[PDB]
Amino acid sequence: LGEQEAFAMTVPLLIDVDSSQQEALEAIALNDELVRVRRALYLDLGVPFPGIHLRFNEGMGEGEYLISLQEVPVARGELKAGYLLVRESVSQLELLGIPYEKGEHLLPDQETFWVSVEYEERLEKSQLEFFSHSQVLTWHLSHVLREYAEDFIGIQETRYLLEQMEGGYGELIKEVQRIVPLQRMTEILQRLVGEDISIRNMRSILEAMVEWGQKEKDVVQLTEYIRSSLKRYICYKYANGNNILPAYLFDQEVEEKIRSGVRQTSAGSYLALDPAVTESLLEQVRKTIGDLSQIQSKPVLIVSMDIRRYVRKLIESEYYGLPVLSYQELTQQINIQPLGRVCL
Amino acid sequence: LGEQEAFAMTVPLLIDVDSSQQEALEAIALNDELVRVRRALYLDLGVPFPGIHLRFNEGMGEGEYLISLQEVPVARGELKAGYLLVRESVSQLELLGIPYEKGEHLLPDQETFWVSVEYEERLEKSQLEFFSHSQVLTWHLSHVLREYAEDFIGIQETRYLLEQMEGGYGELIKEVQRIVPLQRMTEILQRLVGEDISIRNMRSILEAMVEWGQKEKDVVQLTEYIRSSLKRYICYKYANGNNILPAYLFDQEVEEKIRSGVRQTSAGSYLALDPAVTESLLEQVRKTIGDLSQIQSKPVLIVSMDIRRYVRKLIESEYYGLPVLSYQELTQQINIQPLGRVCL
């Protein structure tokens, strides 16, 4: 036992589902239904995701499954599709109009109710959302990555991109590395994928990295200049229609209250107004935006560039699916259709 | 005798149990029951523990055993299971309701009373905690490491991690070594494992090492920023339930008395208020927290980040099993359920 300790590396991503399916589930693909949603999610965000280890554990129950990032279960579940109970995401009284018996739960994103596989034939005629045992699993996965993609872009992973691109763009990389150190360039790539912006376009992120890495030095400013280099991308991510975008402009009185609380002190530049002012603004927002749960068409808040960040991490608690843009990121020839200006 | 001195290295960890078992104990494993609890404890903390030498000494009695860190017995014991008296940890009047004769002691952590091996058959029916001759030994071991894990992470042991990780994360390490010297990076890894935080996740400790090792320079601040990188880990170590955490918030009046006594002088930043104020605060704590011996569910104190340390080493005498958190380490989506605010 005198062997010293034999260090063992932690696993980057891990899926632990129960036993009793290690050969029973195992048959849609569950080795080509993960690698499919990992690639299909890579081409969306661009993060070089890690290898998903798949372990069928017997220690848990029979419908349990936990998805552990680095040995801390981040989205566990007891799939009561355990035997076969293919769930329903947009479950409603329509599943009472389509009367097949239900099973209650609040599986995360939409109201989940479960029906059996004889009931499936008739409800698939009725056309609602069906999640097989693959699609119930990967969905949380494709939701775990999209929300924890700030943790897979580390100094070891960008140096993977800046090596994989050596062939294509030689003199671009040998120029960017001398201007922005790897720590600083990575502290940006995390800040893009935080707003669900896609790294994928890795060239025009380095063009705008070289251009501004000499003039600007505060990361939060530099990333607002770099988003402004993906102009005609964002116009396509948020406003899919004919150059019309449903916005929620901030009336100038507020964009000035926030620009006066930046506190550029210790490379944090924290927005520090007051625990009593934050609730004042966050109320004026909640008073106009409402809840946006019924509000369709995915609106976006639109605020000046230099505070586009601090507004984002402010309402990040209440309004999570409300992206924030800038005036600059808005490529011209976009018809902002203001839903309602946020007064004070 | 002219041989100069022939230097002989001290042993890192050493178990000295008596003779008369060197072949009699020797049969559960006692070479695979230590290496099992050493590995099982490594995957918990992450420290690369040393090799446990096992020596059966005759110089002692017949039920004695001492566990010596570097030749100073740190947890000795005369196991009065000497012949066979498998102990009981949660001994109570239930062992008078289950009337089998007892043997009194205060073996450390829970009330230890001993019963024989014919009594074992019936009390194992009654379902209380049994410690065989292995489990009485390793338990102190798995308690010695967990409490002296600040002594196994030295500059020689982190350079073992930063070499074992060269393969996986090359450019991460070649970046962190130039930012934080080995002394400074190790003075952190000791400060994590001091709070029972787990080094194990060695990547996101280096990501947050690179990020903050340039801005912050006081170790105690840097480690409070590094704990804030293991956010969604701590949420799982202290609040296992559904995002609900039983806290003991500090009312703001106190968190300001302590922030005024930091004395950042000689890289010690000692909290120096008064031997008469420390008893004032430590009384207001003891007046609300009580004793927490009956208080179940493992509550945690929750104080602002910048003094999370000085509060910890303050109550470290009285309330040892009361972990202290920050507001920052608390990942959002955690329902702090304040048990009672510590007023002044």
Author numbering:
A (entry chain D), B (entry chain E): 361 to 704
Quote the study on this structure:
Type III secretion systems (T3SS) are bacterial macromolecular machines that facilitate transport of protein substrates across the bacterial cell envelope. The FlhA/SctV cytoplasmic domain is known to form a nonameric ring underneath FliPQR-FlhB/SctRSTU, but the full-length FlhA/SctV complex remains poorly characterised.
The Ye-SctV cytoplasmic domain 18-mer is made up of two nonamers dimerising via the cytoplasm facing side of the cytoplasmic domain. This assembly is not consistent with the known localisation of SctV in the injectisome and is therefore considered to be an artefact of the removing the complex from the constraint of the membrane. The demonstration of the open state opens up the possibility that SctV binds to substrate-chaperone complexes in an analogous manner to that described for FlhA, in which chaperones bind between Sub-Domain(SD)4 and SD2 and are sterically unable to access the binding site in the closed state. While molecular dynamics simulations suggested that E. coli SctV does not easily switch between open and closed state, our SctV and the C. pneumoniae SctV structure show that SctV can exist in the open state.
